[PDB]
Design an enzyme around this catalytic site. Structure first.
Site, mmCIF file in Angstrom:
data_model
loop_
_atom_site.group_PDB
_atom_site.id
_atom_site.type_symbol
_atom_site.label_atom_id
_atom_site.label_comp_id
_atom_site.label_asym_id
_atom_site.label_seq_id
_atom_site.Cartn_x
_atom_site.Cartn_y
_atom_site.Cartn_z
ATOM 1 N N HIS A 133 -3.580 -9.767 -0.666
ATOM 2 C CA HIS A 133 -2.729 -9.065 0.298
ATOM 3 C C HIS A 133 -3.509 -8.100 1.155
ATOM 4 O O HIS A 133 -2.623 -7.718 2.152
ATOM 5 C CB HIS A 133 -1.939 -8.150 -0.975
ATOM 6 N N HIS A 168 -5.709 3.073 3.723
ATOM 7 C CA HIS A 168 -5.404 4.102 2.312
ATOM 8 C C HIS A 168 -6.536 4.231 1.508
ATOM 9 O O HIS A 168 -7.109 3.375 1.022
ATOM 10 C CB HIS A 168 -4.119 3.362 1.730
ATOM 11 N N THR A 194 3.730 1.407 -1.335
ATOM 12 C CA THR A 194 4.336 0.656 -0.208
ATOM 13 C C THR A 194 4.274 -0.627 -0.650
ATOM 14 O O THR A 194 4.435 -1.428 0.303
ATOM 15 C CB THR A 194 3.700 1.123 1.279
ATOM 16 N N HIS A 197 -8.058 0.043 0.949
ATOM 17 C CA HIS A 197 -7.463 -0.782 1.561
ATOM 18 C C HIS A 197 -6.896 -0.809 3.048
ATOM 19 O O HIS A 197 -6.993 0.341 3.273
ATOM 20 C CB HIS A 197 -6.558 -1.669 0.729
ATOM 21 N N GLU A 246 1.576 1.414 8.592
ATOM 22 C CA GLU A 246 2.679 1.509 7.575
ATOM 23 C C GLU A 246 3.542 2.599 8.182
ATOM 24 O O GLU A 246 4.614 2.646 8.574
ATOM 25 C CB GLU A 246 2.067 1.573 6.186
ATOM 26 N N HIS A 278 -3.906 -1.949 6.048
ATOM 27 C CA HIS A 278 -2.736 -2.865 6.695
ATOM 28 C C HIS A 278 -2.994 -2.815 8.090
ATOM 29 O O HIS A 278 -3.547 -2.199 8.668
ATOM 30 C CB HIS A 278 -1.458 -2.076 6.213
HETATM 31 C C1 LIG Z 1 -1.728 -4.702 1.566
HETATM 32 O O1 LIG Z 1 -1.414 -4.041 0.344
HETATM 33 C C2 LIG Z 1 -2.291 -3.735 -0.835
HETATM 34 O O2 LIG Z 1 -2.787 -4.643 -0.939
HETATM 35 C C3 LIG Z 1 -2.077 -2.617 -1.664
HETATM 36 C C4 LIG Z 1 -1.440 -1.326 -1.353
HETATM 37 C C5 LIG Z 1 -1.422 -0.338 -2.169
HETATM 38 S S1 LIG Z 1 -0.753 0.958 -1.722
HETATM 39 N N1 LIG Z 1 -0.373 0.785 0.019
HETATM 40 O O3 LIG Z 1 -1.611 2.406 -1.698
HETATM 41 O O4 LIG Z 1 0.428 1.165 -2.301
HETATM 42 C C6 LIG Z 1 -1.894 -0.208 -3.553
HETATM 43 S S2 LIG Z 1 -1.790 0.969 -4.652
HETATM 44 C C7 LIG Z 1 -2.599 0.587 -5.778
HETATM 45 C C8 LIG Z 1 -2.586 1.833 -6.971
HETATM 46 C C9 LIG Z 1 -3.281 1.535 -8.177
HETATM 47 C C10 LIG Z 1 -2.262 0.699 -9.079
HETATM 48 C C11 LIG Z 1 -1.345 -0.203 -8.172
HETATM 49 C C12 LIG Z 1 -2.049 -0.657 -6.875
HETATM 50 C C13 LIG Z 1 -2.464 -1.342 -3.781
HETATM 51 C C14 LIG Z 1 -2.546 -2.742 -3.055
HETATM 52 CL CL1 LIG Z 1 -3.357 -4.177 -3.814
HETATM 53 ZN ZN LIG Z 2 -1.822 0.744 1.292
#
Ligand SMILES: COC(=O)c1cc(S(N)(=O)=O)c(SC2CCCCC2)cc1Cl
Ligand SMILES: [Zn+2]
Ligand SMILES: COC(=O)c1cc(S(N)(=O)=O)c(SC2CCCCC2)cc1Cl
Ligand SMILES: [Zn+2]
Lengths: 260, 260
Positions: B64, B115, B196, B89, B102, B91
């Site tokens: 992702h 983020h 998101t 991470h 985003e 986007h």
């Molecule tokens: C490209 O998007 C991502 O890969 C991603 C994007 C987010 S975000 N945009 O912060 O919601 C999270 S959040 C993470 C928090 C800890 C438990 C669930 C995943 C995890 C992920 Cl894995």
């Molecule tokens: Zn994110």
């Protein structure tokens, strides 16, 4: 059932209407990085758009928008098939946020948006049957900007009074539907897309005119306040507002333009 | 499974991840008509952000995004409880349409978005456990535009070649995470929102810094073209591009600002 707010909203549509989570969804943001000038985008011909003011056409509240039934004698020339009209309708915001166009330009909403919907009459007998079939549909989109009063758009709006509730219907005098069109209908955006509403079938050749038309503050207030998604006798009435879908992912598409 | 394209795309998220169709969905468009200065919004302090170049940190392509696992003694001070870091991470878009943020500002997409995800360590053992809990999560978001070379972002982009394919992992020497932040971190948007990505839990206190950072088109291009969503030995490899959710409707609700 489906709506534009909360549980039954556009993120939930795919639950019931699978093409809503499919490819080639509309609407989209028109921005320079995804535009492609195409010399084959010849001007369209609007045949039978001049409706007699002595004839009547049905305005309907369908719970989602207000729509005016069009005769199939009216049609588009200039596409791969003949596309005969079935209806027109509108999408809009709300008194507090008068920006409810479906297509945006460079991330900006217009006040509102008119859709003139046609079906492939060479392949299919009616819009319903064309609806989920290849080359089924062709919509003209007209972006609407808050501006001067539009006597032509008022030929629809002066009747909103008679269609306040889902299922209500009023006969409306014919007029020249070309008066609803902006200038230089030869300048347009063109792309492959979908219904912007369930079932979101990916069967629509979109044509979005380059220039907007203008309707007044008062016209928009009227459109944003006249209508209900609900039957006159529903005890959970929902105001017909923000009846616009969020722009969608491009899925590798381009938007071909008749201008550079 | 869940993706940002095709059958399993974001419009289909609600089917297996019902919160994606629920309330307080992110991301949103930040526009003045929904902004309200709140004088209570004091600077956050970032404690433990200065990771020693002595120490190495895991970088994962998870199919992702690229993700950098951060240590939990890294944290936000200034919130109602202590929020400890779990990872960062990004986007991004695609080389032809390099607009992959985003959050948008007045309908404008930025190039990319970073983020830094923190969880409420006062109440919860990990971010996983915090993720479906009230006020479980605080994310910091940085908007990224093209501009001058960014040596501190390069501390991440230098290693993208080691994690081209999904499941791949690389160690990154520590640096000061606070160098990934923009000018004048005191200036930020603050609202209640969601993840998101699935399961889209409405559990996130969002902080989006007013000011973007810059990375060179070379930096931005590396990121857009460096990675694949697919395992090394997937016969049909998919480029990792456009890993950003469409902005959500934001109805009858406000974004607060620390700047007037
Ligand atoms: C490209 O998007 C991502 O890969 C991603 C994007 C987010 S975000 N945009 O912060 O919601 C999270 S959040 C993470 C928090 C800890 C438990 C669930 C995943 C995890 C992920 Cl894995
Ligand atoms: Zn994110
Ligand atoms: C608020 O949205 C609408 O009410 C609407 C919106 C569309 S659209 N925007 O053109 O996708 C169509 S066209 C379609 C309706 C079902 C069968 C084929 C014609 C019909 C309608 Cl009735
Ligand atoms: Zn429509």
């Amino acid at each position: 059932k489906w709506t534009y707010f909360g549980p039954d909203g556009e993120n939930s549509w795919s639950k019931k209407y699978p093409s809503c989570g499919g490819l080639l969804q509309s609407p989209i943001d028109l921005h320079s990085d995804i535009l492609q000038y195409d010399a084959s985008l010849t001007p369209l011909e609007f045949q039978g758009y001049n409706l007699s003011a002595n004839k009547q056409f049905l305005l309907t509240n369908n719970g989602h928008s207000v729509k005016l039934n069009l005769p199939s004698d009216m049609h588009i020339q200039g596409l791969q098939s003949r596309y005969s009209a079935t209806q027109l309708h509108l999408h809009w915001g709300n008194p507090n946020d008068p920006h409810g166009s479906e297509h945006t330009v460079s991330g900006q909403h217009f006040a509102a948006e008119l859709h003139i919907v046609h079906y492939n009459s060479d392949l299919y007998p009616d819009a319903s049957t064309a609806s989920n079939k290849s080359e089924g549909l062709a919509v003209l989109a007209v972006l609407i900007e808050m501006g001067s009063f539009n006597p032509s758009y008022d030929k629809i709006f002066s009747h909103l009074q008679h269609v306040k509730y889902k299922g209500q219907e009023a006969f409306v005098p014919g007029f020249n539907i070309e008066e609803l069109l902006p200038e230089r209908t030869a300048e347009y955006y063109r792309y492959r897309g979908s219904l912007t509403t369930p079932p979101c079938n990916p069967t629509v050749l979109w044509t979005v005119f380059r220039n907007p038309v203008q309707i007044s503050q008062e016209q928009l207030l009227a459109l944003e306040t006249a209508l209900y998604c609900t039957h006159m006798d529903d005890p959970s009435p929902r105001e017909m507002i923000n009846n616009f879908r969020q722009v969608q992912k491009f899925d590798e598409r381009l938007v071909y333009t008749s201008f550079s």
